[PDB]
């Protein structure tokens, strides 16, 4: 509360390992569904299910310009990339697959780098 408060947590390199993760994410052989936006105008179902579309280079342009504010709202938008995955494709599709495979190994990361 007012002149009270926990003790700080060094978040000045979290920009960096953000940064690395991202790097990571993008370097995976199984990132290539999530590179560049899903096309709207060529993927019938996509602009009126998907309400919020997420990818990794959205992100990296975020992250490069200073669009989020602190560490958890970057997670969020990796997480809605994997979450919008599985609302539009079947587990047993190789987009799927490959959305599943992609969350696993950056919770992973999340939880090494920063737990
Ligand atoms: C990330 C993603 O769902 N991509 C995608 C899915 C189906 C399709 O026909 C074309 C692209």
Same mark, same amino acid.
């Given at each position: 509360s007012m002149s009270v408060k926990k003790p700080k947590r060094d978040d000045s390199k979290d920009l960096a390992l953000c940064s690395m993760i991202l790097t990571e994410m993008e370097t995976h052989e199984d990132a290539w569904p999530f590179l560049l936006p899903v096309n709207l105008k060529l993927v019938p179902g996509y602009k009126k299910v998907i309400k919020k579309p997420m990818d990794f280079s959205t992100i990296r342009e975020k992250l490069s310009s200073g669009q989020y504010p602190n560490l958890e709202t970057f997670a969020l938008d990796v997480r809605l990339v994997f979450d919008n995955c599985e609302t539009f494709n079947? !587990? !047993?599709?190789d987009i799927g697959r490959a959305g599943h495979n992609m969350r696993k190994y950056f919770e992973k990361k999340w939880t090494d780098t920063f737990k």
């Open positions: 079947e !587990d !047993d599709s």
